[PDB]
Every structure is written in structure tokens, then in C-alpha cells.
From a paper:
CRISPR-Cas systems are prokaryotic adaptive immune systems and phages use anti-CRISPR proteins (Acrs) to counteract these systems. In the type I-F system, after pre-crRNA is transcribed, Cas6f processes the pre-crRNA into small crRNAs, binds it, and further assembles with one Cas8f, one Cas5f, and six Cas7f proteins to generate the crRNA-guided surveillance complex (Csy complex). AcrIF24 targets the Cas7f subunits by engaging up to five Cas7f subunits (Cas7.2f-7.6 f), sterically blocks access to the crRNA guide by the complementary target DNA, and induces non-sequence-specific DNA binding to the Csy complex. AcrIF24 forms a homodimer and further induces dimerization of the Csy complex.
The cylindrical density above the AcrIF24 CTD in the Csy-AcrIF24-dsDNANS structure is similar to that in the cryo-EM map of Csy-AcrIF24-dsDNASP, which makes it difficult to determine the orientation of this segment of dsDNA. Meanwhile, in the Csy-AcrIF24-dsDNANS structure, the densities near the hook domains of both Cas8f subunits are also much weaker than those in the Csy-AcrIF24-dsDNASP structure, making it only possible to determine the orientation but not the sequence of the DNA segments. Taken together, dsDNANS is bound at similar sites as dsDNASP in the Csy-AcrIF24 complex. Surprisingly, these mutations decreased the binding of not only dsDNASP, but also that of dsDNANS to the Csy-AcrIF24 complex. However, since the dsDNANS lacks the PAM region and protospacer sequence, it is sequence non-specifically recognized by the PAM-interacting region of Csy-AcrIF24, but not sequence specifically as dsDNASP.
Residue numbers in the entry:
A (entry chain A): 11 to 434
B (entry chain U): 2 to 76
C (entry chain U): 153 to 228
D (entry chain B): 3 to 223, 239 to 322
E (entry chain H): 7 to 338
F (entry chain G): 6 to 236, 241 to 338
DNA sequence: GGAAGCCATCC
DNA sequence: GGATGGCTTCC
């Protein structure tokens, strides 16, 4: 009805846009002939283009542009093992991307735009009378257009792969292998690219940003993503994957998947007296963040005392593990044990928390350090940790602070036992 | 052309230069007669980009001025 | 000051501390003009920049009442 | 599935320009499926010549050094590339983006065969060393023996050998060797309980993985929500898209003698734990197991906690 | 015919060559020499490009002069006291040259297996191994640092177990960049290479080179690949390759320096030996020698050698087996 | 036959970085342990001295600007308060073999280039260019601002074949002017050494030192740096392991000032040899391309259309070849 | 003839 | 920058 008239108006607008690039020599007559041919047989020209195009959710060309294989439109079932990530998690909000010729992509975009407005996007298969009455196509032209649209909506592919795919093995239980060819998902990454764009950009996002600059706290959330990596698809033109790669501009943001200490910085192990005093504190970036979190978690209440006690125990265990790991990294990172000039208490701690007695150290001092493990170094470290954690009489007067002191004592005892087992 | 954000002004420096092959310009952020920051920005920048280049310094100045001149509290 | 003998009218740069979208209150010139019962144009007359270039000083009463209504000075 | 009886440790492996991306969503450490494939290829190459089967992999990741740069105007980060040689026309090449990185990993392997019975542990350690010194891990060749000739020798350790406290003290003497590193295990149960918490809000599935690995900054009642460990995304494995295909039914295959599948990658959650927070070392071995009834292709670490 | 899938893995894997500096006549004590770091500095140049010449227009030229042009670059120099550069890398040889990693059809597989069995049974690797020992004898891997030097010295060491098997030293400037002569130590090295290429096992070497350059002069490590593609401010126009805060050369650059052996490209012979590639294309001249229009590219020579059994001469045999030992991924 | 698409040239005459040290006059023969001069900081009070835009010319605005001056901190370098002599030492390296490009496309093009430069070598040696280079080393042009108003400047030049001295020189760089090129036996001997180096007939490595007598505690001038933003510091200098230094390209630019053949005039003096020979100190280009005397037109008129220009213009083109750069499209 | 090759034009 | 072809366009 009105959709075919809108398609004819869009064809006339495309003819006017093709007449905007007009040549003064002979562009007028060619533009008039092209507009007449378009307004005559736009559907007859578009059926042969819609026969060429296929809708797809998994694509092989992002693996390599020179390879060609089977491209599949399929939503696999949800697996039995719970707690996973796949395409099965969403079914209602999918957006399929198509591979094909560029003028065919223009014809498919025109077919999708005619699919909007009315219910034509789902009714392109089941409609004869109103569609043929609106489009100006006849009964035979409408039947041929319905056949071409049912063909373009179909896959129409042969099962084959290429030599530049991955097609890896996976062993079977107690038996042989299968070949496993992976396909690049495109609808899933279009969805999460939309979600990541909405996270990084949006009125609510910038409003929460200026909120966290002004610390005005209206009921709202604020998300943030650190250290993404950016990948580029193909050469300069991105649409050769699909039109989804045209609207994503050939860009995919990658999530960080890193080991904890991936910035190998130099160690300030050396014998500074104030350096030894600060190393007894041990102010680091992650250690400073943990100390800030522990200081912020001091003023809590006891209504969530189960979850609060669990979070406090997890934070204390993480702090103890980070301290032990930093001590081990400082020890093994040390190439040799040097006699520190004026390392005030640094020698008393580094009798055990420092490296083995090398040629720079005395053999009698090494035997004396092997005679007595650093239990007093553990006591000084527990004292520095208890001084780092802000305490008050509310914890002394309350039973929850006594339980937190008992948990800190158990953690300090475990750390002293782990130190004394390796020590000596 | 200057940009005015309240009592603050952002002016360019009247003769650019080429850094890394691209033309640039120096900008200065003023608070009355007192100059606060200087950056070097390329051309093809809209005024919104020049705004949020300095927005953070503006916000920090607001935070410090709010904390310093806070009124007294009785209890 | 509250004493009329020592008061002087503010300049445009001081007046931009409270009025305008860049100011710390974050109130517009139109809303501040409606807060004083004036037109937008007569209020824009105040914030031109120099009195030679068609600019008038604000009154004592309008200045103190405007500081009252914006929640800056109590002005009893 | 099975409990290994002997634990063999590869001390410190120095790898250059291994694959960094290893997934269509992440770009950090390579996949544990590469480690399962490496120990399977180590079994197929030489481990059948001494009557052992090998089950699981342990990794510790001493150091990380990737060739990544920041393009001086933004908070993201861009990859370094290499120059492919010329096309025959001499114009240029098709630019494809890859990620190189340098690693430092210790490999912990379990054993089930007649370990000390057919031959002592020293000679089988030396021969599996000389076997391992000629391969690649994830596209990255092993740099050979250099002035680190001190971590050259390995040692096999019997799992249930000795008493229980003797096994405990042998475990402690072994974890006194792997000091600067972190093991990596699956933590799907944390994802289960967290998904159960946010199911009270709404029933979304991938958001549980998405929201648990960002820095959410909470509104004041200006604070941050905390997760207690080093929660890192990981590729769980594969789910198939197509049924099983015949060894000749698909064209241009690698080998025309093995059935074929078309799969999609499955993603999960991992965690970097200290070596001194675990009780038994048999909790950190990566076994590759298959479910051919569905598309389930899984590597994991069962019997962890 | 040949299969749809064909792939070879790389043999002769090198390492990233790290750089360090020190003084001459102490190179035997060069186990602790300090590294060479990368710094930054600022440069200001003028316009010296060929302009469009329809915009010469002297007023606009004087206009474009008076806006200055500033960049930030990287640099790497020796210290003011040292006068010698030390480069060190390792090299692992594998053996098992013929076998591919992938083949779609087994008939081409065992046909290739038997024809390379014939080729190894006809003659040994001694030509290729002699040329490889030449390319390690002269220091081609010191790409620009070799140019204009004063005295170059190489040290090659055989490593069987954790100790040295055997040592070698040379004077790399006496061996030219031009031809391939013979030498007893070089032929012993070629014997080691031919044994290592024979599938016998992993042969391991550590190579260390030295060069008298001067005090405080500059060295040349590798560069990086950065794409601009951005509205933002200009980045630094040069960045160097560093490994753990020390200057270094890429592995593929020295690997490309090693395989410069082919003197049988049909165009001429005065331009010198080049690297071995399928339809061998240098990047320095931007031109592909051994055009596939001629029957001297690698694919047609192989398809005549194994499929149609038309065996070319020994030079093309050396060429195709060098392209086999280079590795690659073939197919349709 | 046309010009190639790409064309690259390495540079001969590679210098080092020049660092400074201080000490006393008449102890300059013991100058091997003189301590380096260092870079410190100090604070300066800026004042209003620019022109005004005719809107900022109200007297109230001017006095209000006078009332609040801005503050800055700035790097500086001085001699010690007891020493009075500045020592600058660097290392020059002459390469030779200047005809060949390092990158090319058309083989006939580079063959024509090679026979052109070979014919130039056969007609005249490098004696004019080497004479002018040894002149620029004789006077201390590389002492850029430190030469200005100096009391007396002496320079030792030293030849290094193996790790020891081959032959030395010494000069009075104030006796040699800045304007003209004279003759001297030691100077032409050094020029013959440089010409032997430039022909590829043996490699030459030199180290140069220079002593300038200035005064107690006065200011010296190292090279500068680039500041993109500040919030604080406004001027920084250049240093290598805490010693004041000059950029190497500054020394190279001070070495190539030999061009006395630009068509405009002769009262200005020699300039550096550039394509479209320009000076940033004056913002003006000599050898405009409208006149037929820039480098590119002279080059492809010598090679493609085979017009050998005048002999001193051939000196200019060969000097542009020695400096090296990026040519082509 | 048929293929391949190049160029071309589309998006 | 991959895809499809259309008149040329060889041999």
C-alpha cells in the first residue's frame, strides 16, 4: 500500500542523488534514462540482486580476508553445564549481518527499509495483495519477488571450508579426535559493542561522570572499563565483513585478560635507612589501594556482620598474600645481598626477609641468620600492619572488633608459620 | 577567538606551529589576571574539545575552593 | 558589605561568578532575570563588559536581593 | 577424573613472540587449551616411549612482556606489527593484526604410568627436557639454554609418596621453588553465585561475566565495589554450531581422515592465586575432556577446592 | 597434484639480539658489560621536500618557512668512554627438513617425501651450510652498524650440554659480502650445520660480535610499526625496539639477514646475493625478481620437480630446498 | 628516463654529541678530569613587555596587569665561580663513498647518477669541499653563542687511526674569521686528510676539543628542549647523565655553513647547504625555485637533460648529496 | 575456444 | 578492498 509508494519515493530520491553528481556534457540524458528505468523496473532489477545475498551470524572472513568457506546462520542450543557464555543467552534482540555485493547491500537495505513502517520485515514472505498494489509490481512480478525474497532469506550455501582457517583437533575420551573449525561471531560482538558504547557514552554516563566529579549522589550507577585493546579488521574499507563492520568502522575493543603484575618495575631493595623504614611500611600501588580499602572498611556497622566479616577476612588474606608475594619477589628479584649503609632496621628484618648470605655478606652472619629465624621481623610486620589499620575503642568494646582481632592474629600466625618454615 | 567559562577564559596564541607534521596551537587558561595552565592542541578541534581539555583543572579548582572557604560548624 | 556608604557595584568579572552557565551557581541569565522581575534584555544590559559600551551598574538593593535569592548570602 | 601419582615440573621456560590475542574478546595470556595441546603433543611425541600417560598442566607465569604501545591521545592501547615481505607486484601487503608477547612460565605435569619403575626419575626428566627443547607453545619458540644453566635440572615428585605429613612437607619444599608467580584456575562457582545474586534483579547471563570484571564506581549513600581475588576472563572452550561431518564431506580439510565440526568459542572466568594458598598441588592441573553428544569441548581444573 | 593445504614450520630459529657496550681489548671480559639504553630528544627541521611545484609561489614559501617544524625522536648512543659495541644472540637448528606440518592429500605427501629423500641422498647440505656459515662469518646481521667500521670480530660457540662444546672466532671484514669461498673452520661449521639439518637433533649456538666504531657514536636497533589513523596530536616520529630496558634487534630482521644466499636470480649477478622467497622480492628495490612469467619462481619449479618429474638443475634445487627450509604456508 | 619514485641517501660526516666541562686557563693540557657543568633551576619574575592589541590599552587594565605578575621557574647553567674556561669535546666520523643512494627504483637512473658523480670526482677532487670543511672546523662555528664575545678560543684537533693519536693540530680560532676562506699549510694538510677520507681511500675518525676563555661564573649555553604543556616549569635544557650537552644536529648544522654561491648577494656570508637554501633566523629562502638555482632543478638538469651547470653549483649539488636526505615523490 | 588476465566499478 | 563481470583478448 503505502510501503511501495515509499519505496518508489526512495527510488526517486536515489535517482535525484545520482543526478546530483551530474556531468555538463551528457549527464542529463543518462540520468533521465536511469531514472525512467528505475521507476519502471526497480523490483525487477532488485530481484537478481536479492538472489545474491545471504543472512549470516558467523563469518569466516575476519579470520583472514583471502579465505572463503561456509558461512552459517544458526543459534545453537544452551549447553547443560550451567554458567557459560554463548549466543544462546539472548534470542529476542539479535541483529544478523549479511555478506554480499555492495549494490546488493543497497538493495537489501532498501528491502529492510520497506520491511519497516508496516509489518513487512516479518511479512515479506506472507503478503501478496497489498504489497503488489503498493509496489506497482504485478501478480507475476509479485510472485517472482516473493520467490526471490524467500531465496535471499535462505542461506544457499555448500558445506566447505578453506585452507586458511584454523580447524583444530580436540581429543575424545580414550579415543581419537575431531576437527574443530572456529567461526568468528559477529552478532554477539555487535551486541556487546553496542553495550560497551552505551557504557562509555550516553547522557547517563556523562551525568554520572560529572556527578562523580561533584560527588552529588542521586540514585544512579557508574561503570568504567580500564585498558582495552583495539583491533582493526582488514584494510581501509571495513564493510567487506558486513554492514555491521561498516557501522563499527572495522573496530573491536578487547577486554584485558592479564596476569596481576604485568608492569615489571625496578625494585627499591637497596639500603636506604628511610628506604628501610618505608619498606617496613611497604607502600606500593596495590598495597596502597588495599590499605585505602581497609581504612574505608573500618567504619562499617554490624547489621551485615556476616558478609562484612567475610569481606574483611578476604581483604586481610589478600593483604597477607600480597605481602608474602612482594617479599618473595623482592628476595628473588635481588641479584645479590649487599651490606646496606645505614639500613636502619633493614638488616634486622633482612636477616630472614633478605637473600642468602652471599660473598658480600659474612659467613658467620649467615650462620647466625640460619640459627634464628626472623620471628621478631614477623612481630614488627604485624605491628606495622596493626598500625596501618585504624583501630579504636568501638572495636575493643564491641565483639566484632574482637573477632576481627582474632582473625588478624590467626592470619599473622599463619604468616609467621610460613616465614619460619622457609626461614632457617 | 576566546572561550569564556564563567570567570575563566581560554585564548589561543596567535601563531601556531607544526608538531609531528600537523599544525597546532598553544592555549592558555586564565582566572582573571592569573594564568593557570598552558596546553598545545592541534587544529581541527571544536570548542567542546578545548572545553573538556581543561574541565578537570576547573573541577579541581572548584573542589579546593569549596573546601577552603567552608563555613564553621557548631554542635 | 551591608553599609551603603562603603559599598561599590561589582564589575562584570565579579558578576560572572554567580550568573551565567559557567558560573558556580550554574544559573542562567534568563532565570536570574525572571528572579528579579525584569526582561532578559535589561538584564543583559548589566553584563556587557564596560559602561562605555552601553552598560549600567546594578543597584544596591537588586544586588543584595539577588544574592539572597540564589542562596549565597543570607542578607537578613 | 583421575588422580596423578607423580608430579613433574618444568622449571622456567623463556618464550618469545607468543600469540597474545588467543581469543576474539581477550588479549592477555594465551589459552589454557594451548597448554593441554602442548602436553598432548608431548605425550604423542616421546611420552609413549617410556610408558606414561599425562593428564594436566600447571602454569605459574613468572613474567610478562608484551609489545604494546599507547597512541598518546587516549586511554586505550594499540598493537605493534611486523612488516610482511612484498607482494609480487611490489606494492604492499594485506595488513593483518597480531599480538606478540614474551612469557616466563613453569610447567607442572602429572603422571600415571610406571614412573620410577621402568627407569629412575632423573633420566626421564632429562629426556623430557631434551624433547621439550624443540617445539613451540602458542606460536612462540622456546629460547634455548643460556646462562640460566642453574634451573636446568628437573625433578619428579611422587604425589602420595611417603606419609601424609611427608607429602605435605615435600609439597612445601616444592612450593618453596615457585616463588614469583601465580597459578590459574577456573572459578565458575563464583560466577554461579554471583549470577544467582543478580538474578534477583533480572535474568541476564553474560552481564554476570561482564559486570564482575570491570571497575564499578558506586554512588554515595564515590566508592568502588570490590572482588576479593584476581578475577580474569578466560576462554572456556568450544560449542559447536553444526553436527558432525564426515572425513570426506567437507572440502579443503587439514586431513581427510578425521570428522569435522564447526564451533563457536566459549568463555569463562579465571583467577590468579598465590601458590601458598592451596593445600594440594593436584588441584591445579588442566585436563582436556570432551562431550561429543553436544558441542561441549572443555578444559578445566576439577578437584580444586 | 599438490594438495589444497600445505605448510612448513621454520627451522633455524634465532633469538632477539641484545646490545651492550664497552671498551676494546676487554671483550674477553664482556660478560657484565652495561646495556645501551634508548632516550628521547627534540628536533627542529625545515622544509626540504619536493613540493607540488604548482604552489612554489615565493610568498607562500616564505610563509611556510616561518612556522617551525618540531618532532620528538628516539636515539641510542654509546657512552663517551666506551668505543665498542657488543651484540649477542642464540640460534637453534632443528633438522627434519622435508616433512610438512599439513597436507590434505597423502599422495603428494609421500611423493614429496621420496623426492627429498632422493635430494638428500644425491648430495649433502654442504653448499647451503657453507653459505650459511658465510652469512654468519661476515656480520650481515649488523645491518647498518657494520657500515664504515674499523674492526669487526665474531665469536661462535658450540653448545651440546650446559657447557661449551667448541669455539670459533673470525675477522668478519676479511670475508667479503660478495662471494662464497672455503675455509677449514668454516667447513667444520658447515659440517655442524649439515649434521644439524639432517634430523639429528637440536644443535645450539651462541654468537657474539664486536665492532670498533668510536666514542659516543650512535647505533641502530630496530624500529616499530605504528599506524597513525587519528585526529589527535602528532606522536613521536621514531621509536626503537627495546627488551627489558636495553636496545635490541628484531628476530625476523636477523633471520632475514641470514638467508641472503641466492645468487641465481636470472636478471643479473652484479647486484649480489639476496634472500630466498617465492618469486623472490626484495623490499629495498621494491621489485620482484624470479617473475612467475618466467619458470624460475618457486612454485613452478617445485611442480615440475615433484609432480611432472621435470628435474631442473642443481641451482634451482638449492633454491627450492632453501624455500623449503625457510618455511611457509602454501595452498589455494 | 625520469627520476625514480624513491631516493634515499645516508649521511657522511657523522658527529657525536658534545658535552661540556669547566676548568682554569693554562691548565688546559691537563684537561681530562675536569668536572662537568650541571643544570640547576631558579625562579624568575616575568613582566609585561609585549605589544598591546588596542583593546587592552585602558590605563586601569594596564596597571591591574602590573599589579599581578606571573612567576616562572627556568633551567640555567653557569661556570663554577672559580673556573673561567669552558671545554667542549666531541667526535667526528668521516665516511666516504657518497655517490651511491641507499635506496632506489630505476637502475638506469642510479647508473647515470654514478657516472655523473664519477665524472665530477675525475674533474675535481674533494679539495674545495674539504678545504671549506676544515675551515669550519678551524674556527669554532659549533660554539654557537659561546663564541660571541669570548676572550680567546683555542682548538685542538686529533686524529685517531688505531686507539692512539696519529697526528695533531692546534689553531687560534679568532685569527680565522667567519667570513672568508683563506689558505694555510696545516689547514690544507687536514683538508687533504678529510678528502682522503671522503674518497673512500681509508677511514678517518677525529675527536675535537675546544677551549673558550669567558670568565668566572658566567653563563654558558647548551642546547634546548621542547615543552608541550605546563601547570611550573617553562624552560628546560639538554643533558646526558647529568652533564650539559649540545645536540648532534646542531654541530652538523654548524659544519655545513659553506654555501657562498647563492645568487642574492655576498655581504651576508656563507650559509648552510639546503634544498631551497633557507635560514630560520631570517625566515627567508635563498635559491627560490622561480630562479633556476635550487637543488632539485639543478639535479635533474644535470642528470636527465645533461646540462652540467657552473662548477661551484656542482659543488653545491655535491654538498647536498653529502648531507643526504629523502628525495623522490 | 575457454581462462585467465586485467581492468573496472560497485559498495 | 573483496566480488563479479564484460567486452575484449591473449594464445
Amino acid at each position: 500500500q503505502e510501503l511501495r509508494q515509499f519505496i518508489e519515493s526512495f527510488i526517486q530520491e536515489r535517482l535525484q542523488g545520482k543526478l546530483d553528481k551530474l556531468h555538463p556534457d551528457e549527464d542529463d540524458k543518462r540520468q533521465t534514462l536511469l531514472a525512467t528505468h528505475r521507476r519502471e523496473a526497480w523490483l525487477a532489477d532488485a530481484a537478481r540482486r536479492v538472489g545474491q545475498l545471504q543472512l549470516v551470524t558467523h563469518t569466516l572472513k575476519p579470520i583472514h580476508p583471502d579465505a572463503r568457506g561456509s558461512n552459517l546462520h544458526s543459534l545453537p542450543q544452551a549447553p547443560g553445564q550451567p554458567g557459560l557464555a554463548g549466543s544462546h543467552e539472548l534470542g529476542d534482540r539479535l541483529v544478523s549481518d549479511v555478506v554480499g555485493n555492495a549494490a546488493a547491500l543497497d538493495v537489501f537495505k532498501f528491502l529492510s527499509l520497506q520491511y519497516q513502517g508496516k509489518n513487512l520485515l516479518n511479512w515479506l514472505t506472507e503478503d501478496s495483495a497489498e504489497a503488489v498494489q503498493a509496489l506497482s509490481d504485478n501478480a507475476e512480478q509479485a510472485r517472482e519477488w516473493r520467490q526471490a525474497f524467500i531465496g535471499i532469506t535462505a542461506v544457499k550455501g555448500a558445506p566447505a571450508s578453506h585452507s586458511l582457517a584454523k580447524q583444530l583437533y580436540f581429543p575424545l575420551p580414550g579415543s581419537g579426535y575431531h576437527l574443530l573449525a572456529p567461526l568468528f561471531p559477529t552478532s554477539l560482538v555487535h551486541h556487546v559493542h553496542a553495550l560497551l558504547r552505551e557504557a562509555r557514552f550516553g547522557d547517563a554516563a556523562k551525568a554520572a561522570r560529572e556527578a562523580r566529579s561533584r560527588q552529588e549522589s542521586w540514585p544512579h550507577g557508574f561503570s568504567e572499563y580500564p585498558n582495552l585493546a583495539i583491533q582493526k579488521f582488514g584494510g581501509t574499507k571495513p564493510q567487506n565483513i558486513s554492514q555491521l563492520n561498516s557501522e563499527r568502522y572495522g573496530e573491536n575493543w578487547l577486554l584485558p585478560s592479564l596476569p596481576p603484575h604485568w608492569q615489571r618495575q625496578d625494585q627499591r631493595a637497596p639500603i636506604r635507612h628511610s628506604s628501610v623504614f618505608e619498606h617496613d611500611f611497604g607502600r606500593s600501588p596495590e598495597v596502597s589501594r588495599l590499605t585505602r580499602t581497609l581504612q574505608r572498611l573500618l567504619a562499617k556497622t554490624r547489621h551485615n556482620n556476616f558478609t562484612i566479616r567475610r569481606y574483611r577476612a578476604q581483604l586481610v588474606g589478600q593483604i597477607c598474600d600480597e605481602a608474602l608475594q612482594y617479599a618473595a619477589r623482592l628476595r628473588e628479584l635481588e641479584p645479590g645481598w649487599s651490606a646496606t649503609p645505614g639500613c636502619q632496621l633493614h638488616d634486622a628484618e633482612q636477616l630472614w626477609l633478605d637473600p642468602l648470605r652471599a660473598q658480600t655478606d659474612e659467613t658467620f652472619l649467615q650462620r647466625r641468620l640460619r640459627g634464628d629465624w626472623p620471628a621478631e621481623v614477623g612481630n614488627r610486620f604485624a605491628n606495622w600492619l596493626n598500625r596501618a589499620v585504624s583501630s579504636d575503642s568501638q572495636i575493643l568494646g564491641s565483639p566484632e572488633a574482637a573477632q576481627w582481632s582474632q582473625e588478624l592474629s590467626k592470619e599473622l600466625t599463619m604468616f609467621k608459620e610460613i616465614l619460619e618454615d622457609e626461614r632457617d | 577567538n576566546a572561550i569564556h567559562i564563567g570567570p575563566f577564559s581560554i585564548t589561543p596564541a596567535a601563531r601556531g606551529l607544526h608538531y609531528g607534521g600537523l599544525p597546532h596551537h598553544q592555549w592558555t587558561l586564565y582566572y582573571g589576571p592569573r594564568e593557570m595552565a598552558i596546553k598545545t592542541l592541534p587544529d581541527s578541534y571544536t570548542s567542546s574539545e578545548v572545553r573538556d581539555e581543561f574541565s578537570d583543572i576547573i573541577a579541581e579548582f572548584v573542589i579546593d575552593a569549596r573546601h577552603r572557604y567552608a563555613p564553621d560548624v557548631l554542635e | 558589605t551591608h553599609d551603603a556608604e562603603e559599598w561599590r557595584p561589582p564589575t562584570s568579572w565579579e558578576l560572572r561568578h554567580v550568573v551565567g552557565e559557567g558560573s558556580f551557581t550554574g544559573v542562567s541569565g534568563a532565570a536570574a532575570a525572571a528572579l528579579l522581575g525584569m526582561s532578559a534584555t535589561n538584564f543583559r544590559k548589566y553584563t556587557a563588559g564596560d559602561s562605555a559600551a552601553n552598560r549600567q551598574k546594578i543597584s544596591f538593593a537588586a544586588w543584595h536581593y539577588l544574592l539572597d535569592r540564589l542562596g549565597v548570602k543570607r542578607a537578613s | 577424573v583421575t588422580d596423578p601419582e607423580a608430579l613433574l615440573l618444568l622449571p622456567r621456560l623463556s618464550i618469545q613472540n607468543a600469540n597474545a590475542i588467543s581469543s576474539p574478546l581477550t588479549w592477555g595470556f594465551p589459552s589454557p587449551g594451548a597448554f593441554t595441546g602442548f602436553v598432548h603433543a608431548l605425550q604423542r611425541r616421546v611420552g609413549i616411549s617410556l610408558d606414561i600417560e599425562l593428564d594436566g598442566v600447571g602454569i605459574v607465569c613468572h613474567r610478562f612482556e608484551a609489545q604494546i604501545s599507547q597512541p598518546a591521545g587516549k586511554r586505550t592501547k594499540v598493537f605493534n606489527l611486523t612488516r610482511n615481505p612484498l607482494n609480487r607486484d611490489g606494492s604492499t601487503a594485506a595488513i593483518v593484526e597480531e599480538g606478540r608477547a614474551h612469557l616466563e612460565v613453569s610447567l607442572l605435569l602429572g603422571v600415571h604410568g610406571d614412573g620410577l619403575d621402568d627407569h629412575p626419575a632423573q633420566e626421564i626428566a632429562r629426556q623430557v627436557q631434551e624433547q621439550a627443547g624443540a617445539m613451540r607453545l602458542a606460536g612462540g619458540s622456546i629460547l634455548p639454554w643460556c646462562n640460566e644453566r642453574f634451573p636446568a635440572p628437573n625433578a619428579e615428585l611422587l604425589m602420595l609418596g611417603g606419609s601424609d605429613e611427608q607429602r605435605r612437607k615435600n609439597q612445601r619444599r616444592l612450593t618453596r621453588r615457585l616463588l614469583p608467580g601465580f597459578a590459574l584456575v577456573s572459578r565458575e562457582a563464583l560466577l554461579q553465585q554471583h549470577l544467582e545474586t543478580l538474578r534477583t534483579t533480572l535474568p541476564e547471563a553474560t552481564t554476570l561475566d561482564a559486570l564482575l570484571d570491570l571497575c564499578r564506581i558506586n554512588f554515595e549513600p564515590w566508592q568502588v565495589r570490590d572482588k576479593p581475588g584476581w578475577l580474569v576472563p578466560i576462554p572456556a572452550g568450544y560449542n559447536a554450531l553444526s553436527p558432525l561431518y564426515l572425513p570426506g564431506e567437507v572440502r579443503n580439510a587439514r586431513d581427510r581422515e578425521t570428522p569435522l565440526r564447526f564451533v563457536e568459542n566459549l568463555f569463562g572466568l579465571g583467577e590468579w592465586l598465590s601458590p601458598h594458598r592451596v593445600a594440594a598441588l593436584s588441584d591445579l592441573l588442566w585436563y582436556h575432556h570432551a562431550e561429543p553428544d553436544k558441542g561441549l569441548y572443555r578444559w578445566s581444573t576439577p578437584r580444586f577446592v | 597434484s599438490t594438495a589444497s593445504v600445505l605448510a612448513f614450520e621454520r627451522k633455524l630459529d634465532p633469538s632477539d639480539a641484545l646490545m651492550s657496550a664497552g671498551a676494546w681489548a676487554q671483550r674477553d671480559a664482556s660478560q657484565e658489560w652495561p646495556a645501551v639504553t634508548v632516550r628521547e630528544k627534540s628536533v627542529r627541521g625545515t622544509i626540504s621536500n619536493r613540493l607540488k611545484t604548482k604552489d612554489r609561489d615565493p610568498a607562500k614559501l616564505d610563509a611556510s618557512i616561518q612556522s617551525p617544524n618540531l618532532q620528538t625522536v628516539d636515539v641510542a648512543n654509546l657512552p663517551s668512554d666506551a668505543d665498542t659495541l657488543k651484540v649477542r644472540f642464540t640460534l637453534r637448528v632443528l633438522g627434519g627438513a622435508g616433512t610438512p606440518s599439513a597436507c590434505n592429500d597423502a599422495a603428494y605427501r609421500d611423493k614429496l617425501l621420496q623426492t627429498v629423500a632422493t635430494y638428500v641422498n644425491e648430495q649433502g647440505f654442504a653448499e647451503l651450510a657453507r653459505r650459511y656459515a658465510h652469512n654468519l662469518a661476515n656480520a650481515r646481521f649488523l645491518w647498518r652498524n657494520r657500515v664504515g667500521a674499523e674492526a669487526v670480530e665474531v665469536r661462535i660457540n658450540h653448545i651440546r650440554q650446559g657447557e661449551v662444546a667448541r669455539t670459533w672466532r673470525f675477522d668478519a671484514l676479511a670475508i667479503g659480502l660478495r662471494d662464497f669461498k672455503a675455509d677449514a673452520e668454516l667447513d667444520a661449521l658447515a659440517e655442524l650445520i649439515a649434521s644439524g639439518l639432517s634430523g639429528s637433533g637440536h644443535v645450539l649456538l651462541e654468537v657474539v660480535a664486536f665492532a670498533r666504531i668510536g666514542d659516543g657514536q650512535e647505533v641502530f636497533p630496530s624500529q616499530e610499526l605504528i599506524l597513525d589513523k587519528g585526529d589527535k596530536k602528532g606522536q613521536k616520529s621514531k621509536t626503537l625496539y627495546s627488551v627489558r630496558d636495553a636496545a635490541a634487534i628484531h628476530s625476523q630482521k636477523i633471520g632475514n639477514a641470514l638467508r641472503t644466499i641466492d645468487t641465481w636470480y636470472p636478471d643479473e649477478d652484479g647486484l649480489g646475493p639476496i634472500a630466498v622467497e617465492p618469486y623472490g622480492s626484495v623490499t629495498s628495490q621494491g621489485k620482484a625478481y624470479r617473475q612467475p612469467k618466467q619458470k624460475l619462481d618457486f612454485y613452478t619449479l617445485l611442480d615440475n620437480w615433484v609432480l611432472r618429474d621435470e628435474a631442473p638443475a642443481v641451482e634451482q634445487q638449492h633454491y627450492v630446498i632453501a624455500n623449503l627450509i625457510r618455511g611457509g604456508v602454501f595452498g589455494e
